[PDB]
Point group: C4
Chain length 388, copies 4
């Protein structure tokens, strides 16, 4: 077993082909399936596994009541193979409410976070044993990537933030190799609030399209240099730019430099990636809520400030449907490394009222160089059918 490093050109994609779905909510109406949220997937050198943060209970349990709450001690990192849902025999990889996982080539890595909001502990597990841990550095809800981290040449990198969500915070990028932290570096560059980074490998470094939860609808970029521990911020030029809440497409701005101050506050985890001066990107269909999902390439979306010219769009989830979080995950090809993405479709309480629980299901597509068609692959759970 050699170490991962990703020195292959990114695959020239043409859109996204259908790749997987797990129907968690439908099956939850007839079967013992876990209550989760905040999902993600990450492929080890051999196969893709699907993660999520389960709430120490199953859906048709009485314990499902009030799962809208994000943090509880009885929360853990569920992990199965991609395709197989989170049933009663799923292992619980660690105690956690915030997470991230990667695979350096040799073995896994799971940064699991539990504890109180004021003082928390992030445990670093690698190869199955616990190797290190870190304390909160600002006493306000220490959180992490919420998706797959990336390891180049034996060294994994996960960005982490602790401070206030809608107010400035303290973010740093830890370089943790073999489960052991061998460096920490704070944020540098023009970004105002970095939360929930979707990070992909781009030789010889790492890139992150994150979540400004305080000042902007535009998305912060974070650039990590694995050979130097140097950090850099920016923003996505895309005039089309998409977080949620969002302003409007003809009234949205971005200069690639600083928050657009357009409904900035609040948001959702998202993703995007470059191709020269072009930017492939996902977004919910709506500016106001997390309903439906759409992908498209924005011409000059990576190098020209405020470019709002799009080519190649695909509806992933129909506008009359729910979505939520989402992140990108990349996988090595035998020639180039492709980039795929997952999309969490949340059902239940707060939005939906018949029921008192909150859980999600997933869908996932992958970049293709070939031709494709059309559709809308959503949840499919009649709320009147579902228990509670």
């Amino acid at each position: 077993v050699e170490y991962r490093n990703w020195s292959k050109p990114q695959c020239q994609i043409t859109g996204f082909a259908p790749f997987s779905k797990d129907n968690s909510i439908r099956l939850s109406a007839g079967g013992d399936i876990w209550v989760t949220r905040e999902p993600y997937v990450s492929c080890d050198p051999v196969k893709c596994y699907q993660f999520a943060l389960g709430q120490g209970t199953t859906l048709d349990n009485k314990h499902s009541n009030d799962t809208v709450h994000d943090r509880i001690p009885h929360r853990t990192l569920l992990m199965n193979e991609l395709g197989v849902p989170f049933h009663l025999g799923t292992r619980q990889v660690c105690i956690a409410w915030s997470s991230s996982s990667c695979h350096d080539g040799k073995a896994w890595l799971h940064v699991c976070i539990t504890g109180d909001d004021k003082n928390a502990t992030a445990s670093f597990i690698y190869d199955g044993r616990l190797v290190d841990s870190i304390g909160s550095w600002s006493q306000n809800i220490l959180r992490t990537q919420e998706s797959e981290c990336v390891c180049i040449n034996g060294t994994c990198t996960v960005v982490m933030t602790d401070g206030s969500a809608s107010g400035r915070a303290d973010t740093r990028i830890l370089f943790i190799e073999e489960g052991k932290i061998v460096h920490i570096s704070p944020l540098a560059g023009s970004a105002q609030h970095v939360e929930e980074c979707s990070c992909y490998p781009r030789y010889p470094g790492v890139r992150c399209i994150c979540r400004d939860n305080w000042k902007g609808s535009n998305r912060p970029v974070v650039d990590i240099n694995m050979e130097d521990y140097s950090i850099d911020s920016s923003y996505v030029c895309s005039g089309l730019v998409g977080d949620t809440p969002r302003n409007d497409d003809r009234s949205s701005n971005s200069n690639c430099r600083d928050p657009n101050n357009e409904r900035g506050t609040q948001g959702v985890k998202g993703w995007a990636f470059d191709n020269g001066n072009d930017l492939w990107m996902g977004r919910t269909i709506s500016k106001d809520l997390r309903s439906g999902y759409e992908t498209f390439k924005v011409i000059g979306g990576w190098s020209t400030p405020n470019s709002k010219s799009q080519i190649n769009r695909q509806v992933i989830v129909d506008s009359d449907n729910r979505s939520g979080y989402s992140g990108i995950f990349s996988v090595e090809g035998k020639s180039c490394i492709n980039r795929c993405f997952y999309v969490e479709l949340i059902r239940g309480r707060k939005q939906e009222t018949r029921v008192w629980w909150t859980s999600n299901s997933i869908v996932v597509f992958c970049g293709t160089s070939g031709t494709y068609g059309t559709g809308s692959w959503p949840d499919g759970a009649n709320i009147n059918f579902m228990p509670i």
Copy 2:
């Protein structure tokens, strides 16, 4: 791991011995088991796995209502080992309503199809990652083999059709090696409507006994040359010839050349195979419906037009029982490659009315050179016992 190529003489069989059954419907009355249809099996160099197209739900679910519909986004390729039914921990290999799977020796291949009837995408997955994809080429429900494809010397071949079911259509045979499409060839020869091909390897090529859904009760043959990408049609000489609806055994014709124009329209996926001038073949017992199943060798059924002389018959499912789809699957012996076959036994709605769902179970036999006996191995689900 070397590549498959199948350069062994086909085993001289004498009938079919009992091999497997999975009791899916019975167990569905007491346990969380998936709703499926369109099953099939395919043996990797080591063991046989059983596939099916599950409808994003379990049987004793409220989501089971109205599963007679063939296509929905919440449809996926379930896959377990042969014998173990599709329970709540079965992985969902991909999103799909139409499918096919093979194993080139090194790894698997799954051509999964989803999307709209007017524009669909067939995703090609190999070794776990997504390698290519293809768009619909005629805007009318792009479909595929519905059983195992065959790979000789590193190159897999799946025939595919898109166009109208009862009217002519556009069929081609794609040669897709390593998940990557490296050729496409359209249909050639005398066949009028090729759907649902049961294809087996016959060195140094591939043969397919399919489904003429528009003009004939006789079954179309398709011949693929792996070394040339050349195609050829014919029809099965068997005067006995069997699709469904079928005309009558004393009133059925076939000239090995073109549709018999005897109740031609509509049909069902089926199978058959040669042995010199002889043809071993399965068929439902009835001309009108898919009830019961029978196998037998037709003397001169492969080389003499309209031969209706049969030797060696076996009742697989009693005439007072249900059947449906069926396909052949072959497996290499340590001397010759045998040919086995599966039979889908569908229960539920449309035919059966007490319940509102549609699902199947399976049985499967294998060619033998030894002696055998008698029986009728069907479903076994008292509809009055079953939920809904």
Copy 3:
């Protein structure tokens, strides 16, 4: 992987130590667990697996009604590891109502029998594929060992009988190597009715303590020579001799030669083994029914006709409890090959009336050279608790 041959001295045992139990019935009252009967276990070079003949249904199913019947098409060979019960994800190894399984060293072997009582087929599966098959030879319920077969030097041997249960029958001993039958030999020696043989390896041959279901309470012996295909009968000298029904211990006879004609008819599968002139043996506690179980060595029980002198007894199941079938299974030690045994504890219909199903659970002990204590490890299912 080399072939098994067993050229090690049998371990000098001193009684039986506790080894495993699977609580199938208790767990069946709260969980989806299979309905079975006729269990057995067999250790592959690495670990012990537990088999049984499940009735195509789960216990808290409505299909469980009337499972007292021994034969149905919807019957299969369930197989899990020893300890893990037969839950909804257990694979069904083949279609069968009568069975046997062994492991030649390289891979498994399962002689599975289905079909009609008048004409049946015994399918021979090895290494996962189907290699051969055999037809009934007398038109009256073709049956086999019902426990593990034994393979010495690449050649497996399973004894088989077809004919009437309580009247004479046609028994032969087939030598089936690599799934392929390479010889058959009929019965020889003094035995009158051989059914359900418990066969263990005794270099350089095989020995079987069976079930005379027509003329005797004494148990028939069967001796197979792997190097010659020669057969030999006898009977167990033990005056203590135990089948069921049995006569009485002070009124029981055996001359090691022919049926004692003492309640002879009917019986149950059982086991025993030699040690010089001594015979270790299991038996139900009662002469009339299958209730409780006891083991003990009978001094001179192997070489002296009618010896009824016992030393070293152990109650395995209390007299106020149920038992049933049982067989011996041996396992290689790093110095000598030990001999263990399983005991089927049947509950439900015929005997018990509250419920309408029939199923069993198991317990299993193993020979020890060390010291031991005392107990009674039975089922534990309150019939008033159980469903139906």
Copy 4:
């Protein structure tokens, strides 16, 4: 595969980081999960597995009624990977009410105990087969470690006691290598009643912090020499000393030599470990009951009699919550061997009355050299939600 021996310096810890939890009780309210108690975990060279003594039944079973009883024949050693709970497909490793398991490097070892209180049998299983067994030596409930045993250089060691709980007893330390007992040695030194030893490897020997159930609140030490078979007793100097019932922290004594005679009788399995003259140790928060849990290092707690000076405390379970048994388990690092610990959280009958069953769940932390935070990770099962 080489043998374990543990010749690495113990890792200098700084407290305990969060490592795992399995939410068994919550999930038991919606799903088929086992009833257990007396849990523990033990890491094989590759991954950690979690053990427990299940009561031959599931929680929402009617058989769960009256599981407060410690011993029944229908009791077995459940074993899954750490994280995955004990669901219906968990294997039952052996019949047992008292247990211990270790891994010599090559394979496992399970000392399983069943039988009557007056005469019992402890079966020794290694590599899957049964190798030896031992009889009770005093006719009064033969018991063992109840946690992981330790094997240095091919030889495993489990301490064992048989005699009266609250009165003196007969304890010895058996050295059982390859499943075979190759020595036994009785207790030596100053200890009065040794029960439930938590034993960790400390090159080149083994150390055990046990349970004086008759004369003291202080905890007995047991020292085993693997190269000599020599034993030695002591007591923990910690004035803070903690068993339950306990006296009071300002009124508790210990001289490292003999029982403090302070509420001595009764107790609970516990743990502790040295670091020079310092002693890291767990304890329930309360002197009277098993509620809540706390860890801390006691300055001079290993070498100075009656030292009650503590530094570095952590609340693991809040004082308003339940705990119970607990043991230490160590795992090798790539530089030093760390020490972790598990904590059983029992719910149900005796204490809790709404329900009639008794079962536990678990939490588990691991030593860290890094920084940490704060919390209380308990069960989380609303007793009003739970069945029965």
